[PDB]
Structure formats: C-alpha cells, structure tokens
Amino acid sequence: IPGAPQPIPRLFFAGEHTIRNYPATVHGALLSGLREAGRIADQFLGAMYTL
Amino acid sequence: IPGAPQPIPRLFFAGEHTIRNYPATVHGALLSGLREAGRIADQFLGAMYTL
Amino acid sequence: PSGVEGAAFQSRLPHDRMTSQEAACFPDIISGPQQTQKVFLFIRNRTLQLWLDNPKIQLTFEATLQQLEAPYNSDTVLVHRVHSYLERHGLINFGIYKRIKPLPTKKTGKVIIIGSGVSGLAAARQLQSFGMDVTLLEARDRVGGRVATFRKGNYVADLGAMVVTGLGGNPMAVVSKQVNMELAKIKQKCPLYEANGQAVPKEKD
Amino acid sequence: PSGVEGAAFQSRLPHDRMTSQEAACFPDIISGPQQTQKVFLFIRNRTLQLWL
RNA sequence: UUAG
Numbered sequence: 001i002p003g004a005p006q007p008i009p010r011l012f013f014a015g016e017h018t019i020r021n022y023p024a025t026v027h028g029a030l031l032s033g034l035r036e037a038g039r040i041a042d043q044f045l046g047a048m049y050t051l
Numbered sequence: 052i053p054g055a056p057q058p059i060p061r062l063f064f065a066g067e068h069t070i071r072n073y074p075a076t077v078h079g080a081l082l083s084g085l086r087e088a089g090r091i092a093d094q095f096l097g098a099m100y101t102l
Numbered sequence: 103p104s105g106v107e108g109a110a111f112q113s114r115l116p117h118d119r120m121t122s123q124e125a126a127c128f129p130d131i132i133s134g135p136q137q138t139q140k141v142f143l144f145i146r147n148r149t150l151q152l153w154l155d156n157p158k159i160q161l162t163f164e165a166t167l168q169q170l171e172a173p174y175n176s177d178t179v180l181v182h183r184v185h186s187y188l189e190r191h192g193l194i195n196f197g198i199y200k201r202i203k204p205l206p207t208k209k210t211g212k213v214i215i216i217g218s219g220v221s222g223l224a225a226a227r228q229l230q231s232f233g234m235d236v237t238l239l240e241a242r243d244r245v246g247g248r249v250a251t252f253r254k255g256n257y258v259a260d261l262g263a264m265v266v267t268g269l270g271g272n273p274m275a276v277v278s279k280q281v282n283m284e285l286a287k288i289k290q291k292c293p294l295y296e297a298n299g300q301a302v303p304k305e306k307d
Numbered sequence: 308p309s310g311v312e313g314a315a316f317q318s319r320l321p322h323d324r325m326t327s328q329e330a331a332c333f334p335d336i337i338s339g340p341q342q343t344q345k346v347f348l349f350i351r352n353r354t355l356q357l358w359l
Numbered sequence: 360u361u362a363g
C-alpha cells in the first residue's frame with residue numbers, strides 16, 4: 001500500500017555461508033540456525049526479556 | 052487472525068503524567084512528546100542507526 | 103558546565119558516560135574498549151553543542167561533520183549514526199527551526215494524536231519531521247491545553263502554566279531561543295500579611 | 308576452563324565481560340555500576356553451567 | 360474518508 005509503514009522483515013538467511021566466525025563448518029551451520037530462530041522469534045513473538 | 056504474530060504496538064501514551072523524572076511540568080510534557088515521536092518512528096519507519 | 107561538558111549538561115546527559123538508551127542503540131561500542139566510548143561521547147557532546155549554540159536552524163549530518171576536527175571527522179558512519187540517534191530521540195532538531203533538507207512530499211505512516219497540548223504538539227512536529235502523516239484531534243477551540251493564557255487588550259494573565267523552573271538543563275531553554283519568549287526573573291521577596299492585615303515581622307517569617 | 312568460567316568458555320563467551328549482544332538486551336545493566344554487571348555475569352555463567 |  002503506497003504510504004504505509006514497513007517495520008518487519010520477511011526473508012531470513014542461515015547456513016554455513018552466513019556465519020562470519022565459523023564458516024565452512026557443521027557447528028557453524030548449527031549456530032547460524034540458532035541465531036535466526038532467535039531473531040525470527042524476537043521479531044514475531046516479541047522479546048519480553050528486553051524491557 | 053487466530054494463530055498470527057503480533058509484533059508491533061498501536062496505542063502510545065505521552066503527556067505530563069507519563070514522564071517519571073519530570074512530571075507535572077511543561078518541559079516534562081514537551082519531553083514526553085519527543086520520546087514517543089522517536090519510539091513511534093523507530094517502530095514504524097525502522098531504526099537504521101542501530102545496525 | 104562549559105564547552106562540550108555543558109552541552110551534555112543542558113541535554114540532561116552525563117558527559118563522561120554512556121546512558122542506558124545509548125547502550126541500546128550502540129551496543130557494539132559500550133561492550134567494547136573504553137577508547138572507542140570516549141570517541142563516541144565526544145561526537146555526541148560535540149553534536150549537541152552545535153545544535154544548542156544555534157537551535158534556530160536544522161543541524162544536518164553534513165554540517166555536523168564539517169564542523170568536526172580530526173581524527174573525529176574521519177569515522178563518518180559513526181558520526182552519521184550518532185547524528186540520527188540524537189535526531190530521532192529529539193535531542194537535536196526539535197522545536198521550531200528553519201528546515202534545510204525540506205520534507206519529502208511523499209509521507210509514510212499515518213498517526214492520530216489526541217490532544218494539542220505541549221506533549222501532543224511536540225510529538226507532532228517530530229513525527230512530521232520524520233516524514234509521517236500526522237493529524238491532531240483537539241476538543242477545545244484552541245491549542246496549548248493546560249497552557250492557557252488570558253488576553254484582553256495588551257493585558258496578559260496565565261491561568262495555566264506560568265513558571266519556567268530554571269534553564270539549566272531545560273529544553274524550554276532551546277524553545278525560548280526559537281520563540282518570542284520574553285522571560286523575566288522572579289524577585290523572591292515575599293512579604294506575608296496575617297488575616298488582620300498587618301505584615302509579618304521579618305524575624306518571625 | 309573449570310566451574311562457571313568454563314561454562315562461559317564452552318559457550319564461546321567471555322566470563323568477565325558483557326557482550327555486544329548482551330548489552331543490546333540488557334542496556335540498563337551495562338550502562339550502570341560494575342557491581343550489577345558482575346551479578347549479571349554470574350547468573351549468566353551459572354545458568355550455562357547448569358544446562359551444560 | 361469508501362483511510363492510503
């Protein structure tokens with residue numbers, strides 16, 4: 001809608017190639033997964049622990 | 052919609068009675084106004100300065 | 103309070119420490135080395151000084167960077183971040199100033215403000231500056247709310263707010279520089295009179 | 308790494324400092340007195356230990 | 360304002 005506000009994201013990225021400190025690894029893929037799961041939940045379910 | 056995510060707020064509060072450190076004043080009303088203007092803009096326009 | 107240490111004082115901010123609100127928006131900096139935090143705090147205090155020295159016009163990001171001396175005007179993204187933070191939280195570019203960067207014709211978001219007292223009016227100006235569509239709903243036939251001035255002829259009498267309770271750290275200090283505010287000091291000389299009408303002796307008061 | 312100092316190590320976290328990510332979610336604490344930050348870091352390190 |  002022209003002139004509306006767009007605060008939230010929709011497309012998230014995880015995987016081995018998305019983690020700066022642990023690329024090209026299984027544990028790095030693992031951690032990228034946990035990261036976005038937390039970011040998605042933060043953004044859609046709200047982060048109550050930050051108040 | 053049942054089962055949907057509700058991340059954003061809709062009802063904000065300002066005015067003399069909403070500011071802890073400067074209640075019952077004009078400057079306190081003034082500051083409460085600037086606070087919510089920044090919070091509303093943060094939430095609807097997104098805060099680019101936090102990345 | 104003088105120089106940049108005073109700009110922080112006038113903005114109700116500690117000049118040698120980052121605040122909770124600043125930590126939230128600049129978590130990278132406050133969690134890191136103390137040297138960087140000093141660089142942040144100087145840019146913050148300096149930018150406030152620039153605005154406070156001339157609050158009658160918009161302080162742009164460009165105008166801020168050129169008024170800065172090295173090494174500080176070298177890290178331009180940090181300066182931009184700090185500027186937008188202050189701009190957004192209403193520490194600079196608030197009130198009534200002559201706009202440099204004009205408003206975008208295309209707006210984003212619609213906000214209804216209930217009441218055009220000072221809190222409503224202040225928020226509206228800010229949201230308008232950020233490019234949002236703002237409309238105020240006011241029950242009275244006037245703005246100001248509990249700021250209610252009686253006028254007849256050139257006589258004036260405030261039935262609402264009347265006193266500015268100090269200018270040291272008061273955002274009304276900035277507003278008074280932007281407005282036709284003719285402030286006047288208050289002689290704290292205050293004689294009493296008992297019900298009978300006779301003045302109260304000095305020593306007793 | 309042993310005790311709570313090791314729980315932090317095993318979680319790739321500094322045991323005596325708050326991280327950028329922690330500052331973001333607990334800005335009240337990190338901007339405040341160092342005593343409180345120690346209380347935070349112990350609870351963090353201790354909770355990690357329990358899980359681990 | 361048949362809010363965009």
Ligand SMILES: Cc1cc2nc3c(=O)[nH]c(=O)nc-3n(C[C@H](O)[C@H](O)[C@H](O)COP(=O)(O)OP(=O)(O)OC[C@H]3O[C@@H](n4cnc5c(N)ncnc54)[C@H](O)[C@@H]3O)c2cc1C
Pocket residue numbers: 014015016017024025026027029
């Ligand atoms: C030969 C080899 C040896 C390795 N050895 C080690 C090692 O010794 N130690 C170590 O730590 N790491 C090692 N790795 C790296 C590790 O395997 C990977 O980094 C990790 O498994 C990747 O996890 P990921 O979820 O990010 O990617 P992926 O495991 O590739 O997950 C991506 C998924 O998406 C699927 N997919 C692709 N396209 C589509 C599509 N259009 N539609 C739907 N699904 C699609 C894929 O089939 C796949 O299942 C090795 C990798 C290779 C290739």
Ligand SMILES: Cc1cc2nc3c(=O)[nH]c(=O)nc-3n(C[C@H](O)[C@H](O)[C@H](O)COP(=O)(O)OP(=O)(O)OC[C@H]3O[C@@H](n4cnc5c(N)ncnc54)[C@H](O)[C@@H]3O)c2cc1C
Pocket residue numbers: 065066067068075076077078080216217218219220221222239240241242245246247248249261262263264265266267
């Ligand atoms: C007698 C008096 C003296 C004062 N003296 C001082 C002083 O000396 N120094 C100082 O610092 N402060 C002083 N104050 C306080 C100061 O005036 C107020 O705190 C400040 O003006 C309030 O700003 P506000 O926007 O929060 O509230 P308001 O100014 O009341 O704004 C609220 C607006 O909402 C309107 N409204 C109400 N109901 C509705 C409705 N259903 N629909 C639509 N609109 C509605 C109201 O008409 C009003 O315009 C004084 C207050 C009073 C009452």
